[PDB]
Symmetry: D2
């Protein structure tokens, strides 16, 4: 008899399926930071990694497996073939190649393959331009709107709260503030909702977020955009902050928490938007993905900025060939 | 008054010393993996990062700070100057660069780092990750002037973790329940201690006396060979290794910061054991806590195992006695 | 020689002291729920338990110690003598029993406890849970002689947590995303701050102007009424409350031990606010960290809310001025 | 429109069948310690509590729900009716029943299980059953017989706590964390448990090899006292506080973690041992078992000395003696 058979008596060999499986597509700095953060948060019983660069993919999988002793995710798998992703509860897309067209072409291959092996999964899109690519994943997959989630303004809001926390000398967890709309350069800081312990900063300081503000709090949102380009300039890419923010969304979904996050969802029917566009609003996240969304009261200016983003996104999206 | 003063009334300005500070020196793939793993394990109330590449260092610090909302480490700092590292409980060194020439280049790097670390955190524990780890732990010990308990080498911690992963894969059991120790010199010359390999206290060697020999039909020696083979394979495939070392270092940091007194295979002063008479650092199971290595486990080794550690000690001392401090 | 000496070689026999010690005074249902929650959150390297009932105290300590394999707190100690509490960073008081006769009995208990706590941990933060919490936080502050930042009352922490649970149930949103503050005097006379009630920064009062009034067709005033009613209902149903308070106390302990600077509704010296001139403790949002309450949030209250806090401060002072120290 | 409808736009009202649900039957000190430990370890997305004392059950549920802000288990439910337990992955039985007969107390607990087990099976036919109620070895057998479940899905807490206490005591003597002190207590849970001296080690270094007198009466250091103290400790906690709760709750949550997360870690739990150590009867005894999503998929075959083998066989004979007389 083998040493294994001498040591262990088997009761049954019955075929089993993962109960809390997560797949990460694209093993670049973003995908790998998502992976390590998900692993250290014990959110999955199985992690699958997919990429087109086979050697890097194998190396990344092996490196994570070598740290198994320090984790509570018993199975880590990888492959170019999507059969490794079968029965995933959540599929995170961090894969990426004007730039719009080549990322749409990457999705044309990825999304049907994801849908084939995990037809009941929630899709979480991180790849940029995130608002266009969440629409692209929704269009290709044929999934209901609740199961197609864009990372959207989750990171923008996290950076905003970090900067707010630094100015006030308070932990970001206790500094509330929402950055909504189009992810990136065109995002909207909702000044009316910025508060500490339910105390509105705008009520205390009516000049908040205006050019007349002597303390120039508008700079806090300007620094959210500036910080992102600064990190790229300094280290060539960003990874840690996005990975942590994605694992926070993954936690709400995997644990059915029904916490509210600023993520990209199909906004048709709000703020005079009549087109099939995805923009960030506060969404309730759980086991069914986006089950509900918060209807934020926006000022005329804020509403106009979301409508302008929606018009620009639809302008690009109506010319898209699938 | 300012909006801050309108919103918040201050009771005291008194800002005390950080109580559970960790410093990571070198922000390459290894140091950053150590950093993220330490952050996600809530081991520090302050994290300091140091490197000579100023742009990369700032970018890495900012990227970690941007994830603050999702962490419980309220202060993340960085700088080329070691004043940012003041009052660290633990300092992790991952900085580094013919073989005697390569080691000498790391000695010259350590000649700059170690006095600067000692200046700002004289009571810290030093955790050496930089390769060749056994030699560089000796170098850090020699330069710092610290007692042996406060100078810890990552040593065979990763080698053992990989061994347990491979053992777990062969047996269909979680690595946490697969016990096995890889000791001695970190890397190619490490020693798998076959006598201690067990599941639930059941010795694999007692069940299978050929275990770890060339006459073994199942070739369990391949499990230790795969520990060394895997490391080169990861380098070939992605260019470096990061995740496994980062996780293993954070596991050591946890025992130290939380004074757990768990047993880990780390590099310590082995003079006085296995006929070793030279000032060399080799991995043995050590009890880790608030004062670093307080104790070590005296593993019963066979004549062959003892000879391999003695040969490693002789080779290490041969390189060490020629180094310029 | 001994088996221990054959197995383990000792490097140093250095006497060490805990770096993150927490003491719980009173091992009743509340005290023990605080201890298990603190243990499962890895907040302490040492946990000390104190009580006057010696058999129950020993039994509780042993029961916790027997679960050590599943915890990361290496030392659990207990005793009637306060020498077991020496060098505590945080001391949690859950000890205690006409309503006025009751207060004086708790004052008598505190006259023994507080000097003993101060003697062995002069630099600790005191966290008062025992009822009437606002009066007993004042009593602990007066007896200890500690600055106001190091005397914290559990106050409206639990009231706010229950409010957020009830708000969450009505809206179908996790309590973490349902923001609402219950301030002032803990218990029956607490104040729900309707203006701050929000989800994602969207004011419920702006959306529903009748919120918190008798005109309200949805009767949101019942949410605050149910916070008070729930507490008496749990007592009626199981005889005491433990789990919710223990979890809420461990959340405060986390901000203090980890120097998080998160904002919590806790009882603090409110003299100088809302026209209050007496030495009384009431709940306001406080920034909690390594120095206890370093700062407080100045909540804009309506004239009605301000009047309720002033009436509570007058009533608390009325009881306080008659206490014998 | 309601304030909720003004604030929130609903995408779908559809509620999925429970995905990672745990049920705790019996809300005494043991059940509630299991419940708080499971909650603080984020093992379940839904926790169900069942008991026959309706007021205490409601009070315990409400108390846990009031701490929701500090937890990541979004749904806590309770009831006397087992419809609240539907689709549980794992069902933990802690419900239990002045000097009566040995067979008398067992039959009282058997009567309770005759009501519980069919109700559990009705609403969660595919669950894993984890038995904590005493006498655990007999009651795991009873749950197995009544349920009709395959042996892999019926797990007894067994010697999990005995081993945890042993490792704590070993750790205290050696000045090492219990996580690094390895040692197995097997067989019959409680008074008749077997310390496996041959497997006692630190870093793979056998204590028995270093100290051949280990676990014998001639031992000058009396290491037998470490196992004697495991049994003595249990009675001492009962004498001092009236019951035990924290240690059992933590040990049960550790088993729940391996099952819910399919970890395949090895634990000393009670399993149907027929076919081992000359045991021919349908009895449950503790051996190291691999725990995962299908419950006990495998077991470790520990080499026992003649004396150790004899003690397990004597336990098996005693347990079968009681079981063959039980009225179902
Ligand atoms: N939404 C946000 O808040 C946010 C924040 C940071 C980064 N990002 C985005 O994340 C994306 C990735 O960043 P990165 O630094 O990791 O880029 P990267 O180029 O380093 O990694 C991308 C990976 O995707 C892989 N890939 C390409 N085509 C593929 C295919 N057809 N199938 C599978 N994998 C494929 C690549 O091989 C590569 O490994 C970018 O689009 C970036 O803009 C988004
Ligand atoms: N012991 C183990 O088990 C183990 C495992 C994996 C890697 N390693 C080792 O870790 C080390 C680092 O790996 P890496 O991939 O991150 O290398 P790296 O070159 O990518 O990173 C090293 C960093 O050190 C910095 N550095 C150089 N000189 C410095 C100085 N005087 N002060 C401060 N910083 C300085 C560099 O600028 C660089 O950022 C290597 O020596 C490697 O062999 C050890
Ligand atoms: N502030 C809040 O939000 C909140 C919530 C729940 C409970 N509580 C309060 O917590 C307190 C305790 O509740 P409980 O159910 O655990 O009461 P308990 O009577 O069951 O426990 C109290 C313990 O204090 C001990 N004690 C008495 N005198 C002592 C002394 N001089 N030194 C040390 N220990 C002493 C007792 O022996 C007893 O074990 C009560 O006052 C209760 O009102 C407060
Ligand atoms: N196996 C171990 O290692 C271990 C360790 C400690 C305790 N225990 C055991 O756990 C059991 C419980 O301990 P306890 O202190 O909580 O006892 P307890 O009496 O305080 O609690 C038992 C609960 O079960 C309930 N119950 C009774 N009949 C029921 C029924 N038909 N359906 C549902 N619930 C019912 C009771 O109402 C009661 O609330 C005991 O049998 C004890 O021996 C086992
Ligand atoms: N890994 C990687 C590679 C390329 C680009 C990036 C990017 C990037 C893009 C432009 S500047 C930084 C991708 C990306 O969307 C973000 S967030 C962001 C970007 C611009 C403004 C405001 C915010 Cl919050 C970000 O922080 O990083 C990351
Ligand atoms: N990031 C980085 C860069 C260079 C070299 C390395 C290295 C490396 C060296 C040679 S092959 C791999 C450094 C290093 O010592 C290890 S562990 C290791 C190495 C060889 C054999 C057995 C073991 Cl356990 C390891 O895994 O990684 C890492
Ligand atoms: N363990 C124990 C024993 C006796 C009394 C209590 C008490 C209690 C007191 C009066 S009614 C319930 C102690 C106590 O202050 C609380 S919180 C609370 C109490 C009353 C109203 C609103 C709130 Cl949020 C509470 O929930 O519980 C607990
Ligand atoms: N809650 C409660 C109520 C009554 C009895 C118990 C009991 C008890 C039984 C006899 S002495 C203590 C139930 C029980 O099995 C245990 S473990 C145990 C018991 C005896 C010896 C060795 C061990 Cl490890 C234990 O620790 O506690 C618990």
């Amino acid at each position: 008899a083998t040493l294994k058979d001498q040591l262990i008596y088997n009761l049954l060999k019955e075929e089993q399926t993962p109960q809390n499986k997560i797949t990460v597509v694209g093993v670049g700095a973003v995908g790998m930071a998502c992976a390590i953060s998900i692993l250290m948060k014990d959110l999955a019983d199985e992690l699958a990694l997919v990429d087109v660069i086979e050697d890097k993919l194998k190396g990344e999988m092996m490196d994570l497996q070598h740290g198994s002793l320090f984790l509570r995710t018993p199975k880590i798998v990888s492959g170019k073939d999507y059969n490794v992703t079968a029965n995933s509860k959540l599929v995170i897309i961090t894969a990426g190649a004007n730039l719009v067209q080549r990322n749409v072409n990457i999705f044309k291959f990825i999304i049907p393959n994801v849908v084939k092996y995990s037809p009941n999964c929630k899709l979480l899109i991180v790849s940029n331009p995130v608002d266009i690519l969440t629409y692209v994943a929704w269009k290709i997959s044929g999934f209901p709107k609740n199961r197609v989630i864009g990372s959207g303004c989750n990171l923008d809001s996290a950076r905003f709260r970090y900067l707010m926390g630094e100015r006030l000398g308070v932990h970001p967890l206790s500094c509330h503030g929402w950055v909504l709309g189009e992810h990136g350069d065109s995002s909207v800081p909702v000044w009316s909702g910025m508060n500490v312990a339910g105390v509105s900063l705008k009520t205390l300081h009516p000049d908040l977020g205006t050019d007349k503000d002597k303390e120039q709090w508008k700079e806090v949102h300007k620094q959210v955009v500036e910080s992102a380009y600064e990190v790229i300039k300094l280290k060539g890419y960003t990874s840690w902050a996005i990975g942590l923010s994605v694992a926070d969304l993954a936690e709400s979904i995997m644990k059915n928490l029904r916490r509210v996050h600023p993520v990209s969802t199909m906004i048709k029917g709000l703020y005079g938007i009549k087109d099939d566009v995805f923009l960030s609003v506060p969404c309730i996240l759980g086991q069914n993905g986006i089950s509900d969304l918060v209807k934020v009261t926006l000022t005329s200016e804020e509403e106009a900025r979301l409508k302008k983003s929606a018009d620009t996104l639809w302008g690009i999206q109506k010319e898209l060939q699938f």
